[PDB]
Amino acid sequence: MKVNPSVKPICDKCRVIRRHGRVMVICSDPRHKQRQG
Amino acid sequence: PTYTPKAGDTTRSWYVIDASDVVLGRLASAAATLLRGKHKPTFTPNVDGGDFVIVINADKIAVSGDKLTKKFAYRHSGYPGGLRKRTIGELLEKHPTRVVENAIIGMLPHNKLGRQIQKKLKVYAGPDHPHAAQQPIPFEIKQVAQ
């Protein structure tokens, strides 16, 4: 998990979502998994 | 000279308010009005001519938003690090009456008279109360239109 003010899709399989009031990027590649914070 | 209450002048009555599905703040403001005696033309700020208020179904009180989990009642014991907090959700489960009690008390004047006024508030979690001997009048929270 990356926790940063800026969260960006790192590859074209990354999808930006909002979950429980946080912006998150979910992906099949667990490196790209990241959370705004 | 402006009318002033004398010894025998104050007449009490008993009201019962059903708190079921009522917004906490709305119930508390109405009850504070009755306890203070603001609805009587004989009102005098140095006299408690208020009425007795019974609140029933205080566990069915309604709270909006996320206040059930995010509103915290704070208490300090006076010892260092003696600050304890409970959510309104947790306080409603353990001490249902405390939620309504605290709301009303915080809307009364914080002085000696206010403490005497608090005597006349009775709050019960269930649908029943022991004061049938006083024959309380059902009180509905209305709004006078203008």
Partner: protein, 60 residues
């Protein structure tokens, strides 16, 4: 205000209506009526309410 609201009118509309009716009783005596003669106060409330505009929330 307590006596007005017991007669189903707010204070502010009572004062407006008494002005429109031209009733010049001041608040010292209006309060003395509210305490000592509720019947006379009720009659004043009826006068005030009659003199109020039909739509209080309308322009003018």
């Amino acid at each position: 205000n307590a006596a007005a609201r017991a007669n189903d009118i707010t204070y502010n509309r009572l004062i407006q209506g008494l002005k429109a009716a031209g009733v010049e009783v001041d608040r010292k005596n209006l309060a003395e009526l509210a305490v000592s003669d509720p019947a006379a106060f009720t009659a004043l409330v009826d006068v005030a309410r009659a003199a109020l505009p039909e739509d209080v929330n309308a322009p003018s």
